[PDB]
Design a protein around this motif. Sequence first.
Motif, short mmCIF file in Angstrom:
data_model
loop_
_atom_site.label_atom_id
_atom_site.label_comp_id
_atom_site.label_asym_id
_atom_site.label_seq_id
_atom_site.Cartn_x
_atom_site.Cartn_y
_atom_site.Cartn_z
N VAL A 282 0.87 -1.16 0.00
CA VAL A 282 0.00 0.00 0.00
C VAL A 282 0.91 1.22 0.00
O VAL A 282 1.95 1.23 0.68
N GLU A 283 0.54 2.24 -0.76
CA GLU A 283 1.42 3.38 -1.02
C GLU A 283 0.76 4.73 -0.77
O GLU A 283 1.45 5.72 -0.54
N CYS B 12 -0.21 9.21 1.12
CA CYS B 12 0.84 10.22 1.22
C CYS B 12 1.29 10.39 2.66
O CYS B 12 0.58 10.01 3.60
N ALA C 82 1.29 12.99 4.48
CA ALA C 82 0.19 13.69 5.14
C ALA C 82 0.12 13.44 6.65
O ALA C 82 -0.95 13.17 7.21
N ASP D 294 -2.27 10.65 5.57
CA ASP D 294 -3.56 11.05 6.12
C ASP D 294 -3.57 10.94 7.64
O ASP D 294 -3.80 11.93 8.35
N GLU E 253 0.84 18.79 7.23
CA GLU E 253 0.57 19.30 5.89
C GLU E 253 1.82 19.89 5.24
O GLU E 253 1.75 20.36 4.11
N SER F 217 2.94 17.90 2.72
CA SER F 217 1.54 17.84 2.29
C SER F 217 1.09 16.49 1.73
O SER F 217 0.04 16.39 1.09
N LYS G 148 5.23 9.99 -0.75
CA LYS G 148 4.40 8.86 -0.32
C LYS G 148 5.25 7.74 0.26
O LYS G 148 6.41 7.58 -0.11
N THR H 110 5.98 14.14 -4.93
CA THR H 110 4.79 13.46 -5.44
C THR H 110 4.98 12.93 -6.87
O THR H 110 4.67 11.77 -7.14
N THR H 111 5.50 13.79 -7.74
CA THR H 111 5.52 13.59 -9.20
C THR H 111 4.17 13.91 -9.81
O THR H 111 3.20 14.18 -9.11
N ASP H 112 5.59 15.64 -11.41
CA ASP H 112 5.26 16.80 -10.59
C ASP H 112 6.29 17.57 -9.76
O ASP H 112 7.16 18.22 -10.35
N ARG I 179 9.49 17.14 -11.14
CA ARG I 179 9.55 17.65 -12.49
C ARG I 179 9.25 19.15 -12.60
O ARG I 179 9.45 19.76 -13.66
N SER I 180 8.77 19.74 -11.50
CA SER I 180 8.40 21.15 -11.46
C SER I 180 9.61 22.06 -11.50
O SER I 180 9.71 23.02 -10.73
N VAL J 105 12.76 21.29 -11.08
CA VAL J 105 13.70 21.59 -12.17
C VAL J 105 13.21 22.72 -13.06
O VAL J 105 12.04 22.75 -13.43
#
Lengths: 63, 97, 127, 81, 213
Positions: E46-47, E49, E51, E52, E57, E60, E63, E86-88, E91-92, E94
């Motif tokens: 099970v994967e 975040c 975070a 639940d 936060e 936020s 995972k 997260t991915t995102d 990739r952001s 950068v």
Amino acid sequence: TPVTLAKVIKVLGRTGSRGGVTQVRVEFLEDTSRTIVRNVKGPVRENDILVLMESEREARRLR
Amino acid sequence: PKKRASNGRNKKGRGHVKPVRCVNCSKSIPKDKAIKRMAIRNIVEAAAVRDLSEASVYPEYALPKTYNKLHYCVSCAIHARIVRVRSREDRKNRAPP
Amino acid sequence: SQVFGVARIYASFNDTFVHVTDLSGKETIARVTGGMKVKADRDESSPYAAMLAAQDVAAKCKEVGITAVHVKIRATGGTRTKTPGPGGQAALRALARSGLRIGRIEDVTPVPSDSTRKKGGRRGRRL
Amino acid sequence: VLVQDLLHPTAASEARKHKLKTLVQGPRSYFLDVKCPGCLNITTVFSHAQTAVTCESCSTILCTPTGGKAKLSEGTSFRRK
Amino acid sequence: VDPFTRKEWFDIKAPSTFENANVGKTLVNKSTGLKSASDALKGRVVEVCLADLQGSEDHSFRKIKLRVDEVQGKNLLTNFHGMDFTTDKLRSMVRKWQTLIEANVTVKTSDDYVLRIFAIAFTRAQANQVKAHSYAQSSHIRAIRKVISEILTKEVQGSTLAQLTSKLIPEVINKEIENATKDIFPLQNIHVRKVKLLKQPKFDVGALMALHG
RNA sequence: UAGGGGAUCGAAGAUGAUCAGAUACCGUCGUAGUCUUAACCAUAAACUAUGCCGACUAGGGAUCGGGUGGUGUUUUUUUAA
């Protein structure tokens, strides 16, 4: 069947291919300061009380 | 005509380059000439985001992006109206707007 | 006080999937492909099939007691596009419309670190 | 400029211009009489080492060689000449 | 027939080395005279975040991959599987216009786990820096990657998964990088990005049941 | 030409499309080749379609590489360097 009667403020710009659509703000008469921007079909002015049972689709500018 | 004091594109001192394939043409094509763009948008859109921070179980989360580059042939760059035809002079410009 | 099935959406082109599982996903539940809710057979990726399709995902999720949901989007992906088709949008808004809760959203589009030589041929796909 | 004495210009314009054009060429590098603290001795070192020289014999170290100018240690008077 | 009349549920717990133990549920599937069900869907992951779980936060993104080691009651306990960004957000972080770097290093922990970690890390500019940039030189990068290697074997021998885990949650390795690095180069963003298992050894039920109460 | 490599593209070949035909355009796969070692070939819109040496004519404002000068701009650390 819930009817929300919304007043037109700002008539904006002409649209459609054939000019069948104006754009339209609207001020909700019956909750003033909400000022959503739907569309309509007519030969419009400012002050055409406008009728929507669809509260809200908020719409985007159609060729 | 010559057209284009480069030639097309981006190559000097450099002799020959690792090419790229087009998202769209699906042609090949060196990483000069190329013609690259980041869309970046909110996966979400405008209309819905209202029904999302609404029915979420999140008292807000944020709104995570959606990354990507995009490669183009020059043909499909104009067919799809990304790049146009700039008169001759409005060529030797290089501004976003 | 709620439970969480994971979504497991995807829309290229010419088709799209609403595909609930567990949060682990070695088990699965109510899967719904496009063609299913459209026999034109034409538009198999329609901003609509998805639309009446997602509602199957809260019929057979609000059946076996899935309150609520976390939600995944995948392209093709692969070599392909990584430009999400119609689908995933219409789903992501119809799924919010179906009582469902929403949580943790993110892409997964399978990205490569190059290599598998893309189709078409040098001079390209071309009408 | 329609004209100018290039004989003698400013002192300015030389200090900056390149060693090999001040007209008559002349070096920048120059020598630097070092008291390591311990001894009084005085070793005649060069601004651009290439060698670190040892001081006299005390076996000390002095001045590392880099791109151009030594970096000399802490102790060293390094009066120039 | 129905394919949910048979479907018995479950509960997902998690190390205690965490917060809200409480993750949601799963679905599995009963048996016969001869033949069994519990094992029939255990090993699996099970994967969820960060975070639940940490409740917080600030993490936020990122995972946790957990796997069920064994059952009980209906409460399947859990052992750490691995880490993810997260991915995102990878990739952001950068950009165009600036150096990108990379990490890695494997490792025999001692608990004797074999783990591979990834330390991505950028250049940042200066606060006060014409040029549009923020690049590296190259030899400085060679020196940058080697640093990272040690700084990670060292926080891995000094070891365990449990003891390791709470060096990933509060991102303390991230700090340790910046303060051996500054005495170089400026740097930002510095992750661990990942983290994955290989050659995890034999069960030892409670070496794990000691992670709960 | 003979070994190694054979991800991706991708003539050839096969295909489904479109089409009066379509052996082409569009789509999906695809040996060969693209890559490298070692050996061949010597052609090109090999393009400034302008042989090189030189020497002389009329203004500019940019830039790369040097060099010279300005008690020149900051760097500040104490002044320089």
